[PDB]
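question for whoever is on the cluster today: can someone run the full assembly for these? two chains, 294 residues total. i dont have access anymore since they changed the login thing
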Amino acid sequence: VIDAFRLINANMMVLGHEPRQTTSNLGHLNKPSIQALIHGLNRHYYSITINYRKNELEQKMLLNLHKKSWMEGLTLQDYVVKEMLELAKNYNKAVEEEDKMTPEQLAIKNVGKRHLEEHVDVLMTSNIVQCLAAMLDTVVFK
Amino acid sequence: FDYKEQLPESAYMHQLLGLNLLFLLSQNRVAEFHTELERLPAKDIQTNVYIKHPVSLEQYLMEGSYNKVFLAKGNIPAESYTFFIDILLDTIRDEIAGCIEKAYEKILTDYAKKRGWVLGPNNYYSFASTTIPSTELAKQVIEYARQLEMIV
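^ ran it for u. tokens below:
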């Protein structure tokens, strides 16, 4: 929500406010446009374009921070996973079985001038990962 | 094979054909054996005694020729195949090896001495006769294949 403002004197208002000599940057500046309250008090002011300073070392350090710290990427404890999986798959199987009625009716209906349910990518990923865990189970250890 | 419409049938044709048939069984090309059989449907039928001996032998082979080894030999001593039958006879089948003998059944010397005994493989017939991690490697590849499809 941060923003940057700068005031304009009332002496040169006869002269142009902000002499513009670049279309791309002026349009980018206008893209934020002006806020409701901003117009309510936009006068004697003219917002100035802001941007995050180039960031590589800090960017790289943060990126390394995320994997291990800001989300689960310890990579050594990275791999319930066999306890609750049965129950999660039970829920989703029952739900998909139920949802299968709506496509049935949809097909039943003629030309006549909620089948899209997906629910399969989730199962795919979850149980394929669980099966892959065999790789850790049988080789990575012992 | 040649059309040879003028081909004058001779009793030799039947005699020689059976010699292949008898030999073919001798060279355990059983598939080829039937191949020739179906090539002469009009010959076998019920006549052509010349070639009737091999088929009886073949039937006995699929059946228990082991007992009928000398039954077919005595069924007809000769059919112009005096030597022809000899090859088959000396080529005694020995598939019975998948059993127990030699002080365990004792019956079925020189046979018990050939290559040390019987044909050579195994030992004295009286004294003749799980892992997930190994599965791990094979399964791993299979699972990725399923994923590989879900790429695009």
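summary bc i know u wont read the tokens: The radius of gyration of chain B is 25 Å. The longest helix of chain B spans residues 132-149.
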